[PDB]
Design a protein around this ligand. Structure first.
Ligand SMILES: *[C@@H]1O[C@H](CO)[C@@H](O)[C@H](O)[C@H]1NC(C)=O
Ligand SMILES: *[C@@H]1O[C@H](CO)[C@@H](O)[C@H](O)[C@H]1NC(C)=O
Ligand SMILES: *[C@@H]1O[C@H](CO)[C@@H](O)[C@H](O)[C@H]1NC(C)=O
Lengths: 48, 40, 22
């Protein structure tokens, strides 16, 4: 029915209505880091 | 009569695909090198 | 360092080849 990763998380499935095999990549996520000069210098910032 | 099973009698234990991995599972299996009554 | 190569030396490359979530 379904595939699992090395850590036993779900990784792929058959579609219940068609025997084609589809993978499940996690949706994109990550930290937001604010690169800033000191607020004594400027109120400009850049975001990583 | 009797015979050695060797390493036989493994089967896919669940409806799950896995690849490039070593997975440890507890189930009914033919224990390795077990005596297997032989008939004809 | 070897300039033809990642500009590591020869031994400094063997040291890399000898060594090896969402
Ligand atoms: C299931 O029904 C759909 C129509 O809703 C059809 O397209 C699909 O091929 C059917 N699948 C099977 C394997 O019966
Ligand atoms: C920056 O900080 C110093 C004290 O460290 C202060 O005297 C100065 O007025 C500050 N300048 C601005 C533009 O905030
Ligand atoms: C199988 O049975 C025979 C006796 O019939 C015994 O000598 C032998 O050790 C047994 N083999 C195993 C693997 O237990």
């Amino acid at each position: 029915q379904f595939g699992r990763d090395i850590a036993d998380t779900t990784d792929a499935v058959r579609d219940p209505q068609t025997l084609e095999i589809l993978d499940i990549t996690p949706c994109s996520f990550g930290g937001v880091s604010v690169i800033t000069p000191g607020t004594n210098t400027s109120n400009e910032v850049a975001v990583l | 009569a009797y015979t050695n099973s060797f390493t036989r009698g493994v089967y896919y234990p669940d409806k799950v695909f896995r690849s490039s991995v070593l997975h440890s599972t507890q189930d009914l299996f033919l224990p390795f090198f077990s005596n297997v009554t032989w008939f004809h | 360092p070897d300039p033809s190569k990642s500009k590591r030396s020869f031994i400094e490359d063997l040291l890399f080849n000898k060594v090896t979530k969402f």
